[PDB]
Amino acid sequence: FGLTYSQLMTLKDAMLQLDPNAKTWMDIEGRPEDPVEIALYQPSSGCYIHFFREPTDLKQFKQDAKYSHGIDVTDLFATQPGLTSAVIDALPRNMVITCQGSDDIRKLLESQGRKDIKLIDIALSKTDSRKYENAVWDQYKDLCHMHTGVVVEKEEITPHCALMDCIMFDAAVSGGLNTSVLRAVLPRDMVFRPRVVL
RNA sequence: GGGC
RNA sequence: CGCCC
Ligand SMILES: [Mn+2]
Ligand SMILES: [Mn+2]
Ligand SMILES: [Mn+2]
Ligand SMILES: [Zn+2]
């Protein structure tokens, strides 16, 4: 399934930092059956899961990049295969996950056999959900560098990040953005994999 | 319209 | 309106 026992032990220990009962956001970039960026966020603790995956459909990816995420495909080369399945399978049983537009999130969780996970859809408008878009990027821009491509709507807009979306959707529901220290759940060497002769 |  | 619900 991708991961050695040593890595599985590290992952399951890291995911115990998630409070099984706390408010948990989840957003993805890319199609549900072919995701390229996955993020979970718990505002109560400041814990976040954030990782990437290589697209199977390159033609769909390049098209999605111009209208949504703006991820350069070259930057996804060092990603760990099987991370998506391993993280989702390690999520607490009957966990309650909140997000904007639950349809794609549901299809991804169901494709991983996690029908037990309950989903709350906030179902806000694009304007209401992204009221604190500027404020989130102003505070947390250093947490993701992957969105370098120009994203259009014809008007240039801020690229869609799975992690930034989780934070800004929370700020919209709470009616404000808190100054809080964020903590990465996954080790950096687990997200990304490189020598020397050939 | 919502998601990408 | 590129795709998708
Ligand atoms: Mn989404
Ligand atoms: Mn998004
Ligand atoms: Mn629309
Ligand atoms: Zn990102």
Numbering used by the authors: 363 to 515, 522 to 561, 565 to 569
Publication excerpt:
Lassa virus (LASV) nucleoprotein (NP) is the only known 3′-5′ exoribonuclease that can suppress type I interferon (IFN) production possibly by degrading immune-stimulatory RNAs. NP is a multifunctional protein involved in viral genomic RNA encapsidation, viral RNA synthesis, and immune evasion. Our structural, biochemical, and cell-based analyses have demonstrated that NP encodes a functional 3′-5′ exoribonuclease of the DEDDH family at its C terminus and that this RNase activity plays a strikingly important role in IFN suppression. We therefore propose a novel immune evasion mechanism in which NP suppresses the IFN induction by selectively degrading these immune-stimulatory RNAs.
We have also conducted a time course soaking experiment to explore the kinetic process of the LASV NP exoribonuclease function. To do this, we set up a time course experiment to capture the conformational changes of the NP-C·dsRNA complex during the enzymatic reaction. The LASV NP-C·dsRNA complex was soaked in a cryoprotectant solution with 100 mm MnCl2, and the crystals were incubated for 1, 1.5, 5, or 10 min at room temperature under a standard crystallization condition but with pH 5.5 that would slow down the catalytic reaction for the purpose of capturing the different stages of the reaction. Over the time course, the crystal cell volumes changed gradually from 474,825 Å3 to 444,643 Å3. Second, the electron density of the 5′-ppp moiety of the triphosphate dsRNA substrate became clearly visible, and that of an additional nucleotide C4 at the 5′ end of the complementary strand also became partially visible. This strongly suggests that the RNA molecule identified in the NP-C·dsRNA complex structure is indeed an intermediate product of the NP-C exoribonuclease activity. In addition, the electron density for the 4-bp dsRNA in the catalytic cavity became less clear over time, which serves as evidence for the dsRNA moving toward the catalytically active site during the cleavage reaction. Last, the side chain of residue Tyr-429 became structurally disordered, whereas those of other local residues remained unchanged, indicating that the Tyr-429 residue moved from the G5 base to stack against the next C6 base of the complementary strand in the 5′ to 3′ direction (3′-CCCGXXXX-5′) when the cytidine monophosphate was removed from the 3′ end of the cleaving strand (5′-GGGC-3′).
